[PDB]
Amino acid sequence: HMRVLGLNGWPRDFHDASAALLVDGRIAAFAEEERLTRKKHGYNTAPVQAAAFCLAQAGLTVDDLDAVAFGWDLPAMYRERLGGWPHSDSEALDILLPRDVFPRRTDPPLHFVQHHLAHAASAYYFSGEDRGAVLIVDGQGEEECVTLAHAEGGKITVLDTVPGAWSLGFFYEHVSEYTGLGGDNPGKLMGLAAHGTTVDETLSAFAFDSDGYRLNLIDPQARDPEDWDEYSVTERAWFAHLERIYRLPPNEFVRRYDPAKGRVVRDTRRDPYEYRDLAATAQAALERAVFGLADSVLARTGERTLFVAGGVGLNATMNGKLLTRSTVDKMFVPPVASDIGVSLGAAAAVAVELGDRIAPMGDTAAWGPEFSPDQVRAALDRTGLAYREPANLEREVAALIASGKVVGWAQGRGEVGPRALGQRSLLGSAHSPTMRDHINLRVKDREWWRPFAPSMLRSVSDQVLEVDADFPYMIMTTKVRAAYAERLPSVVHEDWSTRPQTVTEASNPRYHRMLTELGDLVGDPVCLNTSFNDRGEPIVSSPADALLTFSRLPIDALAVGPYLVTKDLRH
Ligand SMILES: [Fe+2]
Ligand SMILES: [K+]
Ligand SMILES: [K+]
Ligand SMILES: [K+]
């Protein structure tokens, strides 16, 4: 078997560090650095913890690897932007895989994979489809912000690219920053957009055409002479433009000592909800641009299957509108469409070059660490909390959810990507018309306007959803059928749209059993499934992380491995 370790993350100005290990084309392990370090977004680091976990999980050392692959062409970026690539392969490996954590006798072959090739590999090779059009829409790779390519016969061939100064991902991050949501939280902008109305989707900046878009605000060949990407140049141009054309100036961040918290805390000067029409208009602009790019690559390649990756591929609202287009029959977007996926993509590209066949992802993203009952018990015994070991944990959790309680669920291998998918989730009733406000305001103390989404059995999804297909990742919106347009108020929008996870018995037996039991109580085997964290931390990974979060949030119960902990309500 070939064993290839893919990596993302570097100590200089990088984000989304992660590591993925392919063994004979199968995902043996995959983790994001932030989940193990507890530092959101995996900034400015090699993926030391994630790679250490992957090797441990597989029972390997670096000497057992056939290759190490990195999801950017770093030598090219250093040569073009920083005056030269100074590292031998051995020196680069010492930075990526420091010897104090990764002892080795010799160096594995090191491969640098062009960033958009890594994104494209993370979609195509794991899709279960033998051919299709590839659309990569990113912030920026080494140079380009968009790649259109043709995936066929195991090969990916580039058709066209768009230069970085025209980035749709940077545009959307800059609007998110302008509204006060923050450029690091573009998912919040997508949720805010649902509450606004679009006036003029060009924003007096875009011109749209049947193949995509033009941006008249900035020279497409603009390059920052003092940086290695175009983010600061695009930021300056977009902030100036938005202040000219939109009725509100930028929201500002405010840092003030809060005596209730005993710390300086960051807030915004205005409520970001005031910018909802800008959010709606930016989302409409993004959608129209991407519809053109998607139509273009499908038409050029003669395909009707669309593979999307790059960070903009996390835009589930946009993805759902692509799926319904007359030009698209099938679509695949991996849960790791953002830069966290280029570790996996780089490993895949290299594994394919080495002659392996890559297995489909298969309706799960559960590749991170898991913990045995003894390991969970060790973490529980640290807290001193009382707990139970239910004879039928799934049936008890279903009854708690049916009654309107919120249950933390930490089971099996951690899912990868930004969405909880029944491995590290907070669960609540899909049928309750008060549950959305309860979890947004009482549990998470976040914005009232944030949406929630459901998990449901794949075996009922053809009845619940208008499309009979797998939706394993909560990465694509669709509509419910009439019979469910009012029954599921916490997880279905007024317009009947929803962003589902379908669950198969093979994908997640425990979660499947719990939803089955819940269906016997509330009629539909469907629940609300949100991230097990709050706004200030990554999704929990270890049993100790789950207990720490459980203890600070007014959650009713925690099902962690085979154990059930309930809030200590004795005065
Ligand atoms: Fe990217
Ligand atoms: K203005
Ligand atoms: K369609
Ligand atoms: K208790």
UniProtKB/Swiss-Prot annotation:
ATP binds at K40, R419, R450. Pathway: Antibiotic biosynthesis; kanamycin biosynthesis; Antibiotic biosynthesis; tobramycin biosynthesis. GO terms for biological process: kanamycin biosynthetic process; tobramycin biosynthetic process. Residues 2-355 are annotated as: Kae1-like. Changing M474I: Binds carbamoyl phosphate, but not nucleotide, so that the mutant is unable to catalyze the adenylation. It holds the Pfam family Carbam_trans_C. It seems that TobZ plays a solely passive role in the adenylation reaction: all functional groups appear to be provided by the substrates themselves, representing an extreme form of substrate-assisted catalysis. The role of the iron in catalysis remains unclear. PANTHER family: NODULATION PROTEIN U. Consists of two major domains: the N-terminal domain (Kae1-like) is involved in the transfer of carbamoyl from O-carbamoyladenylate to tobramycin or kanamycin; the C-terminal domain (YrdC-like) is involved in the hydrolysis of carbamoyl phosphate and its subsequent adenylation by ATP. Belongs to the NodU/CmcH family. This is nebramycin 5' synthase.
